[PDB]
Amino acid sequence: SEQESVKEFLAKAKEDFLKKWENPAQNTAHLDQFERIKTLGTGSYGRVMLVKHMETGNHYAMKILDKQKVVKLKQIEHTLNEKRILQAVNFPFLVKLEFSFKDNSNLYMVLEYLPGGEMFSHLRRIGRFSEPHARFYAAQIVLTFEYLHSLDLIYRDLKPENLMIDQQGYIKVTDFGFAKRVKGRTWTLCGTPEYLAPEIILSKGYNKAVDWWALGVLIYEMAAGYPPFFADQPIQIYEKIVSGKVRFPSHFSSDLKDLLRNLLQVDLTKRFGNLKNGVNDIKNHKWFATTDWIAIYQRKVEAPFIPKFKGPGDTSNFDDYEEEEIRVSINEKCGKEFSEF
Amino acid sequence: TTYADFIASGRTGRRNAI
Ligand SMILES: NC(=O)c1cccc2[nH]c(-c3ccc(O)cc3)nc12
């Protein structure tokens, strides 16, 4: 039975997660084991660098956080939770944390390198994705949220910026900074304005249904080339979200608009993914009728777009950033705060 | 058009979390 298979898989996956969650892996590498190639990304968190593991010649993306800045920006819990979740999860569409360690000044997350770059760049370059192209990425998100939500995990930051394309043209969810273990409800104001569910904006207690609303935003942005709610300032974006009046481009198929009306649903008792049949309301929708869910999960489906492969450490799909020094203090900074990292 | 409104706006780049 196909439904008996999913239940057994999820039961084993929960058991694997709880074990790693209870006793997280720590200090599984050292900085001297790597060679820096190029800064791939920057921000308040710190930076992401393409690195080369000296012994193997293998390439990885290394996220480096400055402990002092993390403490100053009050992101200690956010940083610890990001790493604790990432080392405990295992799914084909989730970025793998290969190693983690810390020194006197920094925290290091060595992640699987995704040379295809961000979906964001590909989407802005092409303008908009066709419906079968958008469908292929959407299907991977559906299976990822089904996995995360079974572990009582809410993602909270779905957007093309947090999705990256691998060598096979398959996607990977990246940033686990806003991911949270939620048994019942949560109230924290977090996520990206364009992707926020009305209940977050309205300061209500919320759950995993916020991720299904964000899926509706993602699908709309992939298909149209722009989000369903946009404006110059976040405040003006929020007013559009709470209004809920969605306009669809004329090129959107009827099956697409229908699915979108059910995901971009203000009423929590009517939003797909949040009803009696849970994820199956989405999986069995007409828009996903040509989707072979097992073939997507098993990565057997031919991707609609395969990025230009030019070596394992190729950086052509990333923007250039100022190459800043990696300073390591002689003095141990914030030792107590990052004890569990 | 809707795309034109978006393109001319200040939110076409990578968006930060709040
Ligand atoms: N994996 C990459 O190739 C990569 C490249 C550029 C920026 C990146 N940010 C992340 C990432 C992953 C997990 C996480 O909790 C936070 C950030 N991974 C990359």
Side-chain angles (χ1 to χ4, degrees), chain A residues 1-2 5-6 9-18 20-51 53-54 56-71 73 75-179 181-182 184-203 205-231 233-234 236-244 246 248-307 309 311-324 326-329 331-332 334-335 337-341, chain B:
Chain A
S1 203
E2 281 162 35
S5 304
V6 59
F9 168 92
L10 295 170
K12 202 248 194 72
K14 195 175 192 71
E15 172 197 291
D16 296 351
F17 168 83
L18 288 170
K20 290 186 171 102
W21 175 262
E22 204 64 19
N23 301 283
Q26 287 178 270
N27 185 62
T28 58
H30 190 275
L31 186 64
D32 303 359
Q33 284 196 298
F34 306 90
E35 175 183 302
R36 59 179 287 167
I37 314 306
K38 188 202 169 60
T39 296
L40 302 177
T42 206
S44 71
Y45 65 93
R47 66 206 139 154
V48 188
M49 293 205 70
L50 176 59
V51 298
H53 187 252
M54 303 298 255
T56 61
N58 293 325
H59 290 95
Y60 295 96
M62 180 192 265
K63 169 164 174 166
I64 312 163
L65 301 110
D66 185 301
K67 285 188 268 170
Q68 288 186 124
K69 288 163 206 285
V70 173
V71 169
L73 299 179
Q75 304 301 302
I76 310 162
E77 221 50 73
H78 172 114
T79 302
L80 296 173
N81 177 73
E82 177 188 350
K83 177 258 165 172
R84 192 185 208 203
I85 297 172
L86 213 46
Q87 65 80 40
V89 302
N90 168 44
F91 201 68
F93 317 119
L94 292 177
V95 71
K96 245 130 188 64
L97 180 63
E98 303 275 14
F99 315 91
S100 74
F101 53 99
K102 62 194 173 188
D103 58 19
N104 278 342
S105 292
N106 316 299
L107 306 174
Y108 303 88
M109 276 157 75
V110 179
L111 305 131
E112 137 185 51
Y113 178 52
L114 295 154
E118 279 179 11
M119 185 196 279
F120 184 90
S121 303
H122 297 284
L123 179 57
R124 291 283 179 277
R125 183 164 40 252
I126 304 146
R128 63 176 183 93
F129 297 151
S130 73
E131 286 186 40
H133 189 166
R135 183 185 294 123
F136 171 88
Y137 295 142
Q140 295 165 66
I141 301 308
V142 174
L143 293 172
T144 305
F145 285 180
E146 182 182 0
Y147 166 86
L148 293 178
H149 298 174
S150 70
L151 301 182
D152 306 301
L153 287 171
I154 308 179
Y155 182 63
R156 302 194 300 183
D157 205 17
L158 183 68
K159 57 179 172 195
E161 294 88 322
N162 287 349
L163 305 173
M164 291 185 76
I165 326 298
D166 65 23
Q167 302 88 325
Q168 220 191 316
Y170 277 75
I171 58 172
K172 272 180 220 286
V173 176
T174 55
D175 206 333
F176 266 64
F178 297 108
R181 285 213 86 200
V182 176
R185 287 201 299 171
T186 214
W187 285 261
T188 300
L189 178 74
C190 71
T192 302
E194 286 87 339
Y195 285 76
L196 297 186
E199 58 271 32
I200 299 171
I201 287 149
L202 294 179
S203 288
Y206 65 86
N207 72 348
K208 66 190 185 72
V210 307
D211 281 338
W212 299 119
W213 171 283
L215 173 67
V217 184
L218 188 72
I219 298 168
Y220 186 118
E221 189 171 347
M222 290 190 297
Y226 51 84
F229 318 102
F230 67 79
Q233 295 297 305
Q236 293 115 50
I237 292 166
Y238 302 155
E239 286 167 85
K240 296 208 170 183
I241 292 153
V242 309
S243 296
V246 184
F248 302 104
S250 72
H251 67 77
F252 272 25
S253 67
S254 270
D255 289 342
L256 181 54
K257 291 183 270 179
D258 188 81
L259 175 66
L260 295 177
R261 283 182 204 112
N262 285 297
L263 292 175
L264 297 172
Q265 177 59 266
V266 169
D267 183 23
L268 284 165
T269 68
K270 299 175 186 110
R271 189 186 306 169
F272 271 22
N274 201 51
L275 316 176
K276 188 193 186 180
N277 301 300
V279 73
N280 295 326
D281 283 335
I282 298 154
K283 289 217 247 192
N284 308 333
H285 192 278
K286 253 167 264 184
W287 196 71
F288 289 114
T290 66
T291 303
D292 182 342
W293 296 98
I294 301 309
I296 293 284
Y297 171 74
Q298 283 172 2
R299 314 167 56 103
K300 302 254 191 73
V301 173
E302 184 172 37
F305 165 65
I306 293 115
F309 168 77
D314 182 273
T315 54
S316 55
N317 287 290
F318 290 89
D319 296 307
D320 312 313
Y321 300 86
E322 171 64 297
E323 291 305 326
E324 278 174 20
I326 303 159
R327 228 191 53 95
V328 183
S329 180
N331 315 348
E332 189 199 48
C334 316
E337 297 94 318
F338 304 98
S339 180
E340 74 171 59
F341 191 96
Chain B
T1 71
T2 316
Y3 185 66
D5 298 334
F6 177 69
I7 282 297
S9 194
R11 297 190 66 91
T12 61
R14 300 184 79 257
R15 300 148 294 194
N16 296 317
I18 59 185

Short mmCIF file of all heavy atoms in Angstrom, two decimals, chain A residues 119-130 133-134 160 195 218-227 249 251-252, chain B residues 3 6-7 12 15:
data_model
loop_
_atom_site.label_atom_id
_atom_site.label_comp_id
_atom_site.label_asym_id
_atom_site.label_seq_id
_atom_site.Cartn_x
_atom_site.Cartn_y
_atom_site.Cartn_z
N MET A 119 17.71 30.04 -7.07
CA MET A 119 16.57 30.07 -7.99
C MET A 119 16.27 31.54 -8.30
O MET A 119 15.89 31.87 -9.41
CB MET A 119 15.30 29.44 -7.34
CG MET A 119 14.13 29.35 -8.33
SD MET A 119 12.54 29.07 -7.51
CE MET A 119 12.64 27.28 -7.27
N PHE A 120 16.48 32.42 -7.30
CA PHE A 120 16.25 33.86 -7.45
C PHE A 120 16.86 34.44 -8.75
O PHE A 120 16.15 35.13 -9.48
CB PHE A 120 16.73 34.63 -6.20
CG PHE A 120 16.41 36.09 -6.31
CD1 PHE A 120 15.20 36.58 -5.84
CD2 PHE A 120 17.28 36.98 -6.94
CE1 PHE A 120 14.87 37.93 -6.00
CE2 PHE A 120 16.96 38.32 -7.08
CZ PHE A 120 15.75 38.79 -6.60
N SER A 121 18.16 34.19 -8.99
CA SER A 121 18.90 34.67 -10.16
C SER A 121 18.32 34.13 -11.46
O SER A 121 18.09 34.89 -12.40
CB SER A 121 20.37 34.28 -10.07
OG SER A 121 20.95 34.78 -8.88
N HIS A 122 18.07 32.81 -11.50
CA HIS A 122 17.51 32.14 -12.68
C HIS A 122 16.12 32.68 -13.01
O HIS A 122 15.83 32.94 -14.17
CB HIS A 122 17.50 30.62 -12.50
CG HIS A 122 18.87 30.04 -12.36
ND1 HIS A 122 19.72 29.88 -13.46
CD2 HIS A 122 19.51 29.59 -11.25
CE1 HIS A 122 20.83 29.34 -12.98
NE2 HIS A 122 20.75 29.16 -11.65
N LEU A 123 15.29 32.89 -11.98
CA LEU A 123 13.94 33.41 -12.14
C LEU A 123 13.93 34.85 -12.64
O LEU A 123 13.15 35.17 -13.54
CB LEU A 123 13.11 33.25 -10.83
CG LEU A 123 11.65 33.79 -10.86
CD1 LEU A 123 10.81 33.16 -11.98
CD2 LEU A 123 11.00 33.72 -9.49
N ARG A 124 14.80 35.72 -12.10
CA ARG A 124 14.87 37.12 -12.56
C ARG A 124 15.41 37.21 -14.00
O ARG A 124 14.93 38.02 -14.79
CB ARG A 124 15.68 38.01 -11.60
CG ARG A 124 14.98 38.24 -10.25
CD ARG A 124 13.85 39.26 -10.32
NE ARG A 124 13.22 39.42 -9.00
CZ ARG A 124 12.28 38.63 -8.50
NH1 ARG A 124 11.77 37.64 -9.23
NH2 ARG A 124 11.82 38.82 -7.28
N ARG A 125 16.38 36.35 -14.34
CA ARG A 125 17.00 36.28 -15.66
C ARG A 125 16.00 35.81 -16.71
O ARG A 125 15.85 36.47 -17.74
CB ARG A 125 18.25 35.40 -15.64
CG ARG A 125 19.00 35.33 -16.98
CD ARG A 125 20.42 34.78 -16.86
NE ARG A 125 20.49 33.68 -15.91
CZ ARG A 125 21.04 33.74 -14.71
NH1 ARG A 125 21.67 34.85 -14.32
NH2 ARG A 125 20.99 32.71 -13.89
N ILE A 126 15.28 34.70 -16.44
CA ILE A 126 14.30 34.18 -17.41
C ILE A 126 13.03 35.04 -17.45
O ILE A 126 12.41 35.18 -18.50
CB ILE A 126 14.09 32.64 -17.26
CG1 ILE A 126 15.46 31.91 -17.39
CG2 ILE A 126 13.11 32.11 -18.34
CD1 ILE A 126 15.63 30.63 -16.54
N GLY A 127 12.72 35.69 -16.33
CA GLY A 127 11.54 36.55 -16.20
C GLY A 127 10.52 35.80 -15.39
O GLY A 127 10.30 36.12 -14.22
N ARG A 128 9.95 34.74 -16.00
CA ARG A 128 8.97 33.83 -15.38
C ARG A 128 9.21 32.42 -15.87
O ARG A 128 9.73 32.25 -16.97
CB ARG A 128 7.52 34.27 -15.65
CG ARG A 128 7.08 34.27 -17.12
CD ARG A 128 5.62 34.62 -17.26
NE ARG A 128 5.16 34.54 -18.65
CZ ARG A 128 4.61 33.47 -19.22
NH1 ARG A 128 4.45 32.34 -18.53
NH2 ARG A 128 4.21 33.52 -20.49
N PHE A 129 8.84 31.41 -15.07
CA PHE A 129 8.94 29.99 -15.45
C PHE A 129 7.60 29.55 -16.03
O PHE A 129 6.55 30.02 -15.59
CB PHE A 129 9.25 29.10 -14.22
CG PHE A 129 10.57 29.32 -13.51
CD1 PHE A 129 10.70 29.04 -12.16
CD2 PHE A 129 11.70 29.77 -14.21
CE1 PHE A 129 11.91 29.26 -11.49
CE2 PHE A 129 12.92 29.95 -13.55
CZ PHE A 129 13.01 29.71 -12.20
N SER A 130 7.62 28.62 -16.99
CA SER A 130 6.39 28.05 -17.53
C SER A 130 5.78 27.19 -16.41
O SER A 130 6.47 26.86 -15.45
CB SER A 130 6.74 27.18 -18.80
OG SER A 130 7.37 25.94 -18.38
N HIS A 133 7.53 23.86 -15.55
CA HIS A 133 8.82 24.22 -14.92
C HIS A 133 8.56 24.62 -13.46
O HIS A 133 9.20 24.09 -12.54
CB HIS A 133 9.50 25.36 -15.73
CG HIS A 133 10.92 25.70 -15.35
ND1 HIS A 133 11.71 26.48 -16.17
CD2 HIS A 133 11.63 25.38 -14.24
CE1 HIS A 133 12.88 26.61 -15.55
NE2 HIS A 133 12.88 25.96 -14.38
N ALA A 134 7.58 25.52 -13.23
CA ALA A 134 7.17 25.94 -11.88
C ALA A 134 6.66 24.73 -11.09
O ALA A 134 7.00 24.58 -9.92
CB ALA A 134 6.09 27.02 -11.96
N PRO A 160 12.33 32.42 -3.39
CA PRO A 160 13.35 31.97 -4.36
C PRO A 160 14.78 32.20 -3.86
O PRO A 160 15.64 31.42 -4.21
CB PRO A 160 13.04 32.81 -5.61
CG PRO A 160 11.58 33.17 -5.48
CD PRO A 160 11.39 33.39 -4.00
N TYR A 195 6.16 37.18 1.46
CA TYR A 195 5.84 35.79 1.74
C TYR A 195 5.05 35.55 3.00
O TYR A 195 4.64 34.42 3.25
CB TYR A 195 7.11 34.92 1.66
CG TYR A 195 7.51 34.71 0.22
CD1 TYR A 195 8.14 35.71 -0.51
CD2 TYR A 195 7.20 33.52 -0.43
CE1 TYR A 195 8.39 35.57 -1.88
CE2 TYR A 195 7.51 33.34 -1.78
CZ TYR A 195 8.08 34.37 -2.50
OH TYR A 195 8.31 34.19 -3.84
N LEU A 218 5.22 31.51 -3.58
CA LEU A 218 6.32 30.99 -4.39
C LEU A 218 5.83 30.57 -5.77
O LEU A 218 6.41 31.01 -6.76
CB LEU A 218 7.03 29.79 -3.69
CG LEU A 218 8.31 29.34 -4.40
CD1 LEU A 218 9.45 30.34 -4.23
CD2 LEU A 218 8.73 27.91 -4.02
N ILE A 219 4.76 29.74 -5.84
CA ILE A 219 4.18 29.27 -7.10
C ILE A 219 3.75 30.46 -7.92
O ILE A 219 4.12 30.55 -9.09
CB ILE A 219 3.04 28.24 -6.89
CG1 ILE A 219 3.56 26.95 -6.19
CG2 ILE A 219 2.39 27.88 -8.25
CD1 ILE A 219 2.42 26.02 -5.71
N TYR A 220 3.04 31.41 -7.30
CA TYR A 220 2.62 32.60 -8.04
C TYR A 220 3.86 33.34 -8.62
O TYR A 220 3.87 33.64 -9.81
CB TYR A 220 1.76 33.51 -7.17
CG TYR A 220 1.16 34.69 -7.91
CD1 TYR A 220 -0.22 34.84 -8.03
CD2 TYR A 220 1.97 35.73 -8.38
CE1 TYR A 220 -0.77 35.96 -8.64
CE2 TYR A 220 1.43 36.84 -9.02
CZ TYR A 220 0.06 36.96 -9.12
OH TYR A 220 -0.47 38.07 -9.75
N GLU A 221 4.91 33.57 -7.80
CA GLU A 221 6.11 34.30 -8.27
C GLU A 221 6.84 33.53 -9.37
O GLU A 221 7.29 34.15 -10.33
CB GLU A 221 7.04 34.73 -7.11
CG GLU A 221 8.17 35.67 -7.52
CD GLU A 221 9.05 36.33 -6.46
OE1 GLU A 221 8.70 36.31 -5.26
OE2 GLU A 221 10.08 36.92 -6.85
N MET A 222 6.93 32.20 -9.25
CA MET A 222 7.60 31.41 -10.27
C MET A 222 6.87 31.49 -11.62
O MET A 222 7.51 31.61 -12.66
CB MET A 222 7.75 29.94 -9.84
CG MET A 222 8.74 29.75 -8.71
SD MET A 222 9.09 28.02 -8.43
CE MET A 222 7.43 27.36 -7.92
N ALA A 223 5.53 31.42 -11.57
CA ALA A 223 4.69 31.41 -12.76
C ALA A 223 4.50 32.76 -13.43
O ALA A 223 4.52 32.83 -14.67
CB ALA A 223 3.35 30.76 -12.45
N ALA A 224 4.31 33.84 -12.63
CA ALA A 224 4.10 35.21 -13.10
C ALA A 224 5.38 35.99 -13.37
O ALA A 224 5.42 36.77 -14.32
CB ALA A 224 3.26 35.97 -12.09
N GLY A 225 6.39 35.79 -12.53
CA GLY A 225 7.67 36.50 -12.61
C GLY A 225 7.78 37.60 -11.59
O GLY A 225 8.82 38.26 -11.49
N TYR A 226 6.68 37.83 -10.85
CA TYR A 226 6.54 38.83 -9.79
C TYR A 226 5.63 38.25 -8.67
O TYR A 226 4.79 37.41 -8.98
CB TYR A 226 6.00 40.17 -10.33
CG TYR A 226 4.74 40.07 -11.17
CD1 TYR A 226 3.48 40.03 -10.57
CD2 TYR A 226 4.81 40.09 -12.56
CE1 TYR A 226 2.32 39.92 -11.35
CE2 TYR A 226 3.66 40.02 -13.34
CZ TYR A 226 2.42 39.93 -12.74
OH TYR A 226 1.31 39.89 -13.55
N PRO A 227 5.75 38.68 -7.39
CA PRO A 227 4.88 38.11 -6.34
C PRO A 227 3.42 38.59 -6.41
O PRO A 227 3.15 39.62 -7.04
CB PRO A 227 5.57 38.55 -5.04
CG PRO A 227 6.26 39.81 -5.38
CD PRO A 227 6.71 39.65 -6.82
N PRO A 249 -2.27 36.70 -13.67
CA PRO A 249 -2.00 37.03 -15.09
C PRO A 249 -2.90 36.21 -16.02
O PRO A 249 -3.23 35.08 -15.67
CB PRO A 249 -0.52 36.65 -15.26
CG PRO A 249 0.05 36.65 -13.89
CD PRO A 249 -1.07 36.17 -13.01
N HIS A 251 -2.36 34.55 -18.68
CA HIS A 251 -1.68 33.32 -19.09
C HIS A 251 -1.79 32.17 -18.05
O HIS A 251 -1.54 31.01 -18.41
CB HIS A 251 -0.22 33.59 -19.51
CG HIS A 251 0.69 34.04 -18.40
ND1 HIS A 251 1.19 33.15 -17.46
CD2 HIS A 251 1.21 35.27 -18.15
CE1 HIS A 251 1.98 33.85 -16.67
NE2 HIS A 251 2.03 35.13 -17.04
N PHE A 252 -2.17 32.48 -16.78
CA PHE A 252 -2.33 31.45 -15.73
C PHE A 252 -3.46 30.50 -16.13
O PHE A 252 -4.52 30.98 -16.53
CB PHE A 252 -2.61 32.07 -14.34
CG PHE A 252 -1.41 32.45 -13.48
CD1 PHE A 252 -0.18 32.73 -14.06
CD2 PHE A 252 -1.55 32.59 -12.10
CE1 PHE A 252 0.91 33.11 -13.26
CE2 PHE A 252 -0.46 32.98 -11.31
CZ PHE A 252 0.77 33.24 -11.90
N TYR B 3 3.83 43.70 -14.40
CA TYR B 3 5.28 43.48 -14.43
C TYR B 3 6.03 44.79 -14.41
O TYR B 3 7.03 44.89 -13.70
CB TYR B 3 5.70 42.67 -15.68
CG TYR B 3 7.17 42.31 -15.73
CD1 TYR B 3 7.73 41.44 -14.79
CD2 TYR B 3 7.99 42.77 -16.76
CE1 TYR B 3 9.08 41.06 -14.87
CE2 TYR B 3 9.33 42.39 -16.85
CZ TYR B 3 9.87 41.52 -15.91
OH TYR B 3 11.20 41.14 -15.99
N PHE B 6 6.11 46.36 -10.96
CA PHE B 6 7.10 45.59 -10.20
C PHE B 6 8.55 45.96 -10.56
O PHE B 6 9.34 46.21 -9.65
CB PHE B 6 6.87 44.09 -10.40
CG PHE B 6 7.88 43.19 -9.71
CD1 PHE B 6 7.92 43.09 -8.32
CD2 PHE B 6 8.76 42.41 -10.46
CE1 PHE B 6 8.85 42.26 -7.69
CE2 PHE B 6 9.67 41.55 -9.83
CZ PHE B 6 9.70 41.47 -8.45
N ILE B 7 8.89 45.96 -11.86
CA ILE B 7 10.23 46.24 -12.40
C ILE B 7 10.74 47.63 -12.07
O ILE B 7 11.92 47.80 -11.72
CB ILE B 7 10.29 45.90 -13.92
CG1 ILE B 7 10.43 44.38 -14.13
CG2 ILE B 7 11.36 46.71 -14.71
CD1 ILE B 7 11.74 43.64 -13.58
N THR B 12 12.81 44.45 -6.54
CA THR B 12 13.14 43.45 -7.55
C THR B 12 14.39 42.65 -7.19
O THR B 12 14.62 41.61 -7.79
CB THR B 12 13.28 44.11 -8.93
OG1 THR B 12 14.34 45.07 -8.91
CG2 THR B 12 11.99 44.74 -9.40
N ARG B 15 15.41 39.93 -1.27
CA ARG B 15 14.67 40.49 -0.15
C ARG B 15 15.14 39.92 1.18
O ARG B 15 15.31 38.72 1.32
CB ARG B 15 13.16 40.28 -0.35
CG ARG B 15 12.61 40.94 -1.64
CD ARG B 15 11.43 40.18 -2.27
NE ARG B 15 11.79 38.85 -2.77
CZ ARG B 15 11.02 38.11 -3.58
NH1 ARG B 15 9.86 38.59 -4.01
NH2 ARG B 15 11.42 36.91 -3.97
#
